[PDB]
Structure formats: C-alpha cells, structure tokens
Amino acid sequence: MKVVPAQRCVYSFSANMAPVEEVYPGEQVVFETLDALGSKVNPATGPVFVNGVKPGDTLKVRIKRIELPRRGMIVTGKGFGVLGDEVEGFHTKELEIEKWAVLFDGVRIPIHPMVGVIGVAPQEGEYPTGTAHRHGGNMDTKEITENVTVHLPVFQEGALLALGDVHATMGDGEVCVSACEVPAKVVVEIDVSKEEIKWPVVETNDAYYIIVSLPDIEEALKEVTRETVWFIQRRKTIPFTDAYMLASLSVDVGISQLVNPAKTAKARIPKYIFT
Amino acid sequence: HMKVVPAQRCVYSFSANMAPVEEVYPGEQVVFETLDALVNPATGPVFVNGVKPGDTLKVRIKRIELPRRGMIVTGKGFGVLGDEVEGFHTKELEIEKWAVLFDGVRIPIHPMVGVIGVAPQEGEYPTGTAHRHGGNMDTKEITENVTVHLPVFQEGALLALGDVHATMGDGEVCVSACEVPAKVVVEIDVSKEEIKWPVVETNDAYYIIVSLPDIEEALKEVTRETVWFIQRRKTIPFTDAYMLASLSVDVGISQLVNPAKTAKARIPKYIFT
Ligand SMILES: [Cl-]
Ligand SMILES: [Zn+2]
Ligand SMILES: [Zn+2]
Ligand SMILES: [Zn+2]
Ligand SMILES: [Zn+2]
Numbered sequence A: 001m002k003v004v005p006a007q008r009c010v011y012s013f014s015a016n017m018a019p020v021e022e023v024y025p026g027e028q029v030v031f032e033t034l035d036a037l038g039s040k041v042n043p044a045t046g047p048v049f050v051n052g053v054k055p056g057d058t059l060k061v062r063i064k065r066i067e068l069p070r071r072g073m074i075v076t077g078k079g080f081g082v083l084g085d086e087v088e089g090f091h092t093k094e095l096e097i098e099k100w101a102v103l104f105d106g107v108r109i110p111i112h113p114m115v116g117v118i119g120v121a122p123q124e125g126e127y128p129t130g131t132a133h134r135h136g137g138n139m140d141t142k143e144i145t146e147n148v149t150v151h152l153p154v155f156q157e158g159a160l161l162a163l164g165d166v167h168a169t170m171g172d173g174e175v176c177v178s179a180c181e182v183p184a185k186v187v188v189e190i191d192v193s194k195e196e197i198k199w200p201v202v203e204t205n206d207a208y209y210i211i212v213s214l215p216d217i218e219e220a221l222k223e224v225t226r227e228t229v230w231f232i233q234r235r236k237t238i239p240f241t242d243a244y245m246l247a248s249l250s251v252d253v254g255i256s257q258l259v260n261p262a263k264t265a266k267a268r269i270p271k272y273i274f275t
Numbered sequence B: 001h002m003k004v005v006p007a008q009r010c011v012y013s014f015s016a017n018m019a020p021v022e023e024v025y026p027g028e029q030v031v032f033e034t035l036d037a038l039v040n041p042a043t044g045p046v047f048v049n050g051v052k053p054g055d056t057l058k059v060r061i062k063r064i065e066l067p068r069r070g071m072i073v074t075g076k077g078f079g080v081l082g083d084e085v086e087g088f089h090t091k092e093l094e095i096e097k098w099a100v101l102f103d104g105v106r107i108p109i110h111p112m113v114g115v116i117g118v119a120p121q122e123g124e125y126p127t128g129t130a131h132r133h134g135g136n137m138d139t140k141e142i143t144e145n146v147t148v149h150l151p152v153f154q155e156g157a158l159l160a161l162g163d164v165h166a167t168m169g170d171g172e173v174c175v176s177a178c179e180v181p182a183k184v185v186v187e188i189d190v191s192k193e194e195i196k197w198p199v200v201e202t203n204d205a206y207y208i209i210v211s212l213p214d215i216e217e218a219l220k221e222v223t224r225e226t227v228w229f230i231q232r233r234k235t236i237p238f239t240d241a242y243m244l245a246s247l248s249v250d251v252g253i254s255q256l257v258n259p260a261k262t263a264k265a266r267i268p269k270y271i272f273t
Helices: A217-236 A240-250 B215-234 B238-248
Strands: A002-004 A012-014 A028-033 A044-050 A058-067 A071-077 A090-097 A101-104 A107-110 A114-119 A126-128 A136-138 A149-153 A159-167 A184-193 A201-203 A207-214 A252-257 A263-270 B003-005 B013-015 B022-024 B029-034 B042-048 B056-065 B069-075 B088-094 B099-102 B105-108 B112-117 B124-126 B134-136 B146-151 B157-165 B182-191 B199-201 B205-212 B250-255 B261-268
Touching (some): A028 A044, A044 A114, A044 A184, A058 A114, A058 A159, A071 B238, A090 B238, A107 B238, A114 A149, A159 A184, A207 A217, A217 A252, A217 A263, A217 B215, A240 A263, A240 B069, A240 B088, B003 B022, B029 B042, B029 B157, B042 B112, B042 B182, B056 B157, B112 B146, B205 B215, B215 B238, B215 B261, B238 B261
Parallel strands (some): A002 A028
Antiparallel strands (some): A012 A126, A028 A184, A044 A159, A058 A149, A058 A184, A071 A090, A090 A101, A101 A107, A114 A136, A114 A159, A149 A201, A201 A207, A207 A263, A252 A263, A252 B250, B013 B124, B029 B182, B042 B157, B056 B146, B056 B182, B069 B088, B099 B105, B112 B134, B112 B157, B146 B199, B205 B261, B250 B261
16 A cells, blocks of 8 residues: 655645656555644645546545544644734644543543645646645545545646645634644545536535635635535536525535635535435 | 414514513413514514513523425525526425425425524614524524523513524525424523623534624624633633634534624533533
8 A cells, every 4th residue: 555655745736746656546545644833834745646537537535544643733823813813922732632532621522533635736826735725725624534535626637636734623613723733644545537526525424515715705605605506406407596495405504714815615415415 | 371472463673662562481481473484573572571681581492383384485686696596486395294395305304493582772673684682593503402592682681583494504595494484482581691692502512693794704703702702611711712612613604695694603512511
C-alpha cells in the first residue's frame, strides 16, 4: 500500500501542481498529514495523480480509516473566527484525545474524526489551502468522516488530489476558527466516475451532502439550494416545482463553517427520496 | 379540566396590546386548536397568571395531533428560489402515521409547531415574521416532548401558536412545509430568569433560536449568544467558552424564507453535565 509522507505537500490548490505519487483507480493510499497549525501554513499532503481521470470526471475518495494521535491543539484570538472582532489576545489549548472523547477541562466531547481539507486541482490559477471553492479545499465539513465517499469535480488530468487538516472533533460553524487540530494518517480508496458535477458531494450511508463554498454565506446558501433542487429534478425526472417542494419537505440545509475566506454551506439530501 | 382554545379565536400579529382570549395558571395544560397557515393565524393569545415582564415562559409541548391530509405551496416570489420559479402551485399530501406521502416517496413524519410567540415589547410583528418574542420561526426542533423558553414582555405573556407542519426540511426552501390544522396540547410554566432570545430545550440539548432580516446577522448573533450562554453557566473565561463552542456546538438554519431568517445553535447538555 502506497504512503504519501507529510513532507510532500502544498499550500495552494493550483492548476499546475506537480504530482508526488501516481495511482490506479481502485487503489488504497495512506496520506500522512501534519496538523493545520504548523502562519504561512495549512498543509495538504499530495497531490496524487489518478490514472485515466479526465476533466469533467468525478474523483471518488472513500475514507477508510482516520488514525488519530492522543493530543490535539485548539487556537483562537483577536481577528479570528465569528467573534474575532470582539476577542483579545492569542490563545492555544492542548487537548487530550481518548478513544471516544476529546477532553476539554472537565468536558467529554464525543469524538468525531474528519478530514477538513480535501480538494483537487482547479480549472485555472490557485486557491490557498486555507479557502475553498468547487475543487474542494478547507471545507471543514464534519460529514467527511470514516465510511463516506467524497465526490469531487475534476479540472485537470489525473485530478491531483491533496488532503490534510484532520480534526479529532468539531461542531458545525467552527466558530473560533479552529477545531481540535491534529496530525493524522488517513487511509483512502480512490475511484472515478465519468459523470460531471458542479460542487463537491459527500455520500454517506443514507444521504448526499452537497457542499458549496463562496465568500458570503447567503450566496452559498442560495447556490446549494439551486444545486439541491436540480439534483433531485434530474434524478427523479420530475418538474422543477415538484423538486422544489420535495426539498422543502425532506432536505436539511445547513452550515459547515463560517470562518474561512469562503464560507461553507451544505444540504442533506436523503437517499430515501430515490429508493 | 381541560382548557381548549378554539381556532376561531386567533391573531395575525403579535402586538403589545392584543387582548387575551383565555387565562391559565402555571402548571396547567391547554389545548390549542390551530388552523393551517393558508392570513397566517395563531390561536390565542393565552394570559398566564403570575408571569411578568422580565420572566421566561416555559411551554412544554405534550402532544401535536395531525389530520390525514396536508397542503404544500410555492410559486413566483416564494422561497429561496422565488428568483427563479414561475406560476403558483399547490399539492395535497396524504399523512400516514409514520410518513407524509409525496408521489410515492415516504417522507418520515416530523410533527412541529412553526409559529409560537408572545406579545412583544412595543408595536406589532405579523405572525409570518419573527424576532425575540418568537413568531414564524419554523424550527423543526419545536416538536413533541420539548420545552420552548420564551422571553416575556407583557403582563401574562400572551402566548399564541399556529402554523403546524406534519414534516419539514431545515431551510423550508420553497416557503412552505406540509401545512395542516392540528391540535397542540401544551403545559405552561414560568421561570424568573430574563433571557434574550427563545431557547428550545430538548432531551439532550438547548437550541438558541435567533431571527433577523439577514441570515448573516442571525448567525453572528446566535454565536454570540451561545458563547455567552456557555460562559455564564460554567463560569469559565469567554475565550474558553468560544473554543468550546467550536468543538461542541452545531450552528445551523431553521428557515431562509420568511422576512426574518432564523439561525440556530445546538448546545449539548453534556457540556454542563
Ligand atoms: Cl438567550
Ligand atoms: Zn480547516
Ligand atoms: Zn483545522
Ligand atoms: Zn411557517
Ligand atoms: Zn407553515
């Protein structure tokens, strides 16, 4: 099994990044990731070239295993997070990680391992790994855990997949700017699909989560709704207004994070609507 | 033994000066017979003796009884994608015990009360909008077996309640849910703490519920409130509260379609116990 060591990484998803490993689709790959915190740094291991993947494809990354350490780091301070125009100083706290819980002074927060940065090469230019758009990026979506498949739209040959910013746990919003940041080993399985998509999609056992990242949260919310209704309209071949009504009844619109240059909204679309 | 407010006695605004149509003591159960939102009427208001401005009214929702048929609607200028859509459309929905039916799809049932509120401090807010007193919050957590904490601004609170759904998605994106008339049995109590915004208390979580003209403001406010909520209850420094909300609190959306948009923050009880 191929291992991508943490020392091979990027600080931008760039159209022109060079690969540091090549895989056939169907292969498993271990990514060793450094924590996000270490201020010219938020590193994503990779990028990885996947044979035969073309622009307009969908790269599929199944998250098999996230191996976490026993210590984590959270940080906040002036100018950071949702109330950064209201907090002083710069603060950091070490956090103990047990098998089932992150410990926070007296508190046992249920563990919830997740990959916070995941993306591929964009169409043009470069986006820092600290932000996100259609190619993926710093989406801090907690749904990206073990036993899901992240679908990503492809813009460059080979996809050029990179990944990092693993958290031991997090709440939706990530309001202080950070979660429990940790270095990790993430075991993934990479496959391809020839269908084109606009924005990333996380497939869990019972839901599709469409994930939209734009500079203002209101716009991201409008976009993910537009994308959710169409999704349903195409898969069920029903009139748009019916899909719109169906999404009002069964789709849960939400928030991934409110703190990166691009804000991440999501929409849970249950598989029961198709099955 | 036992009080029933019929649906004919209702308001289309939460006003500071609306007259009660019934009175209750804390500890008593009341039944609100509601009409459907399609005018967005709230049965009441009920005067709760012994509740003063500055207190918190606690409304435990015991039962929501639903009919077997519901109504959903949308069209040009309605919902997130009013942009966007042409015409005007309505659809009857069959309601089974465990599911609302939609052209062969079984949407899991999830009974909820969409409008609930009290008299505001001054002026009037239509029952279709929302603010600190409650209103059209369309929060799917306001379900059976939860407690709604509402801030009080007038003597006796003046509680009203309407707009019941059989099921709903967070966001309510086309403007309407599965709209129905219903019976809602509640149990009213009082707390002598002042609060800023409504809070739904579930079995394992508190949900702070903020409603403002734009969702960005709503989201920032629910976050400010949530962090202060945690800071007081645990007597830890603000920055510790802030970090803890980042790890444990789930910020989300109630609805994006009413004139005030409603954000929420889930604060789990385990962080105190
Ligand atoms: Cl509050
Ligand atoms: Zn991140
Ligand atoms: Zn992070
Ligand atoms: Zn409503
Ligand atoms: Zn309604």
